[PDB]
Symmetry: C8
Subunit: 214 residues, 8 copies
């Protein structure tokens, strides 16, 4: 299911009309917003769509021992891969960082202080930019997009090395707990299915009793 | 079925020709209209297309005990997910809030009083805007669209956290009522099917009796 | 079958080349025409394509008791959903009302009397409009299209609340008549099928008798 | 089969390159031509592609009683639905009436007499129109297309109400003739099939006799 | 098979790059060429692709009685429907007649004699036309295309009425010859199939004898 | 297989970037090249892809009687239909003859001698043509393309009448040789298949013997 | 699985918006970055998605003999083919080397020193290039892209000859270790499957015991 | 498999961005490079993807008799058909020879010596060509592309006649070696399959022994 989740997240980002309020202060709270909030939403949706969550909540409510811990630490990892993809693609595109850290790039060396902040804030994604002064247009876009793509590649490498270090090592892979978990997960589904079966059967008998009065 | 409902709602919004009556007063009653009425229509259609509704209405007409309450509080949740999607996408696009709260943005600081209201009302989605005075064009569009997308993300987060808090907690999940509900829902369908079967059989016998006179 | 009917009605409206005779009087009789006549045609086609209609007509010709009434009041509802969709989409597009009530909008306040009627009649869907005088062009289009879409949303809400109030309440849902109707509808089809079967068999025997003379 | 016939007729009209000989007299004999002749061709093709036609012709050649009449009055109705669709779409498009009744619209009030006829004949579908004199261009097109679409809607309503009045009423629906017709139609096909079967069998025997000399 | 033949003929005409040698005399021998030769080619290909042709030729070589005549008069009709479609579409498009009878239309009344012939020959499908003199450009195109489409409709009606008059009437439909023909056509195929079967079997035996020496 | 061969040849011609070396002498050796060499390549590929060729070569190497002759005269005909299609389409397009016989058309009557040859050689497929002198541009293109398409139609008619005259007449159709050929062609395939079968079986036994030492 | 990995890597490179920070020093650390880091990420993902990795890690943790070595040296080769494809396509496109070694090409012979470095750094992928001085634009692009494609072809040849030299020669192909590896790989999967089977069965028994109290 | 190889090679050539370093000397080493190296890579990949190669290498390592020779001379022919297709299409397009032999065409007769070499080297695929001097632009392109396509057709004919001369004649087609080869190729696959089977079975037994301790 997580595959359709990743594809849906990428396609949804392909359908989000990004645009920056070219204002001196609200930028830092919009780029980071688009960068962080949809990850949180997808990370919670990773818990909504799962089925074991009800059982785990019910068992954690009443005050086995560690198999619950493994189930939880496995569901978290299973759900964590959607926000990673979202952050990855939205850093590789670059519009987010261009929107966020536009009012801070060093104009003095690399490429009214309040008015300076105003213009540099107007820098990204606009044809309302003052223009030549203190920066060109395409230069401040290319610099920020390079920084963004570098952060994106570094982050993807970090997430991938964590994923590689988790699927080989110690974090709750002792075979006993694994077997107990698989047994529990099979038993719950078998119980639901067989209850549905016997319920349907008893209901069929009752309905045959009731119908034939006419 | 709710999946095809969500896809149909999104595609229908993709086929609704939005446009704003650039008038001083009717805006507040058009943006909010497009924002609120189609949600109500979809929320009622969530009850039309369902089948249990007839049984629930019939049982509630005559003056078990709580299983009806669970069936109702489950059907409501099942139907609630179409208006959420509609409001989400129509806030993320931004045309609705741009249409509604255009005659109120502070022109004095951020970016004839009656004439002022008239022009600021003409602001959105038009090439009939007065232009330079008291605001640019793209600035008042970007500001309002940023506000709209922020509200949209906040709302999606709110609906998702409610959905996550409901599918794990107390609101009528005691196993007894759940089992009674599943039993009832299986019995109704089995009754309808078996009645159809025996009716077809008796009819076949009667028809074989009637036909062979020729 | 009604689903393909709704899709066909919408697609047919997508293939009807609308255009307004920019004349002082014929408008009111063209917008309303396109709005009302195709609904009537689709509502009658809802009776043509149905099969029970022959039986109902035959039984109503000779001067059970109420099961006919239920069959009729059910077929009417089954057929009513095509004109609703047609009126809905042709009000949401807006060209119909723009064509109809163009010669009446108040030019004095909101946005030769005979010549005035002539021009305001020429208003919609034309590049032959006089222009600046007494109205702009895009303003009288936007105002009328807003009115049209408001009427459309109100109408869709009205039809949907009627549909929701019918599929839960009193109008001939007493189980006895429902069962009698289902029995009748199964018996008619079973009779036709079995008559076809026995007829084919007797014909096969006769044909085997006739053929083998050569 | 009639469904593919209707779709083929509509698609063929979508592939007929209409154009008007802008001449004073030949118009009336070209619009009406395109309007009437292809209906006749399709109405005859409705008899070619049918199979019962041979039997009916053979039985009518020699000088039961009324079952032939029902078969004929049913085949006619079955074939009549292609020209209806053709006339419907070619009136809704409007080019036919624009081509035909262009040399007659009243130029004096609504919107050398011989030269007048010549120009008004040149009116439709041309950029060789004289222009301003006695009419505009788009006005005489819109007026005629409105008239055409009105005739088209009226005609579709007429054909549909006839179709609804036929499939419920008296015209040869007495069950005896209907049963005789169905019996005859099953017997003919069964005879052909079984003759083919026995012929193939006898031929197989003969061929096995002949082949094995080598 | 004739259906794929008709579709292939139409699509091939959709892929034939028509162009007229704007010369005084060769026109009459190019329009008629494109009009007549491909019909002959398709009419012969209707005999190539058929299988009965070999048998009929073989039986006609040596100097039953009339069943051969029916087989021939049926194969001819079966093959005749490709050139009809070709001529139909290539008259409805109109380029053929425009190319052929361009050097003959009456320039004097309706719309150096040698030079006149030269120009009128240059009339069709060219931007090298002299222009205003003695004719316009679009007028002589529209007139000829109208004539062509009229001939096309008349021809399609003629072919269709012949097809309708043949599939109901006298031309060799006496049941005896029909049955003999069907018997012959089944016997030939059964003979070929069964010979192939027994040949394969004897060959399998021989090959099993030969192979197992190794 | 020959169908996919014809389609592949046509599509390959649709992917051959034709262009003419506008030189006085090399033309005659380029048009004819593109016209003749790919036919030879396809005619040899008709022998490569066939399977009987090995058997026929092997039997012809050693110095029955006439069945080999029939197999050969049948394989040749089977392979001959690809170059026919290639020549047909590459004559109907016309670029080949336009490229070849461009330096020969009579400029004097119909439409430095060395310089004349040079220009007329430059005529086709170029915007480097001298222009007005002794010929226009589109005239010498249309004349040559008409000649090419006439040759193409004549050639297609010739090949089709040969194909029709071969599939009905004398060239080695005596039933004895035909039967011997079919028998031989079945026996070869049956031998190969059954040898493969018995070989696989003996190998399976041997492998089961060898494997189970471990 | 590696096929979908190669296709996904190529398509992902088709969706990476490359762009160069036209700066004097950061180039060398951006071209090489895009060239080297995604290969490392894909090479680690080649270990994540594989299943044997857990077993190999577990066995290597505790301090047979060489079969582990073969499994490892086979998994490495299996995973190595994604970075090869990535480097291949991103060298054949050429943007990487154009971005990296742009500040070094010899301007003096082939095609303020600090300012020279600045301009030559600005060379690639920009319309902000100084222009004529010391180099053209398209020349320094073509030269670098030729160098890049030459390196790409050389690298693809190198990787392919290594792949050909490995799949024929000595590196741990002794049949004993190969058989032991295949046995181990079959046994692990069979163990997992059969454990799942017996676990499901015991769970079904337990659930049937538990359910039927109601 | 070789079919997908040919299609992949052609499509890959459709995705190789060709471009010429317009330099006096490197051309001869770039056209020939693109012409020759990818053929070598594909010819080696024809050995990588094959499976028999391991067996042949293993048997050739230790110092039957001639069946190995036939297997080798068959695998070589099987793999040789990808570079043929590559060279064919990359000669028919013409860019390769245009890139290679551009600095050599005789400018004196047909169409500073160092500067002459420089310009003629700049000739192909550039809009940086000096222009009129000593050659036009399109002429030197057409001449070289004609030469290239002539070489391409000659080469395709050569490869096809070799392929036709090999699949009919002497090169190791004696039936004994062919049968031995087919036997060997069946035995190897049967051995691998049956070993896998028995290994899976023994492993299943062992795993059933091990699992049921819990």
């Amino acid at each position: 299911i997580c595959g359709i989740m990743a594809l849906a997240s990428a396609q949804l980002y392909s359908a989000f009309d990004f645009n920056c309020p070219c204002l001196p202060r609200y930028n830092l709270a919009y780029g980071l917003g688009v960068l962080l909030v949809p990850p949180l939403i997808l990370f919670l949706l990773g818990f909504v769509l799962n089925n074991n969550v009800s059982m785990l909540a019910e068992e954690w409510r009443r005050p086995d021992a560690a198999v619950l811990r493994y189930m939880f630490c496995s569901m978290v990892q299973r759900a964590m891969i959607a926000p990673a993809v979202w952050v990855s693609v939205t850093l590789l595109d670059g519009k987010c960082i261009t929107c966020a850290f536009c009012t801070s790039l060093p104009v003095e060396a690399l490429g009214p202080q309040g008015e300076v902040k105003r213009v540099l804030a107007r820098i990204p994604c606009k044809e309302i930019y003052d223009g030549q002064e203190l920066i060109a247009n395409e230069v401040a876009v290319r610099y920020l997009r390079c920084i963004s793509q570098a952060l994106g590649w570094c982050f993807v490498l970090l997430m991938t090395t964590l994923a590689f270090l988790v699927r080989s090592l110690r974090p709750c892979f002792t075979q006993a707990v694994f077997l107990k978990s698989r047994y529990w997960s099979h038993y719950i589904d078998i119980e639901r299915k067989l209850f549905d079966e016997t319920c349907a059967e008893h209901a069929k008998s009752f309905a045959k009793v009731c119908i034939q009065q006419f």
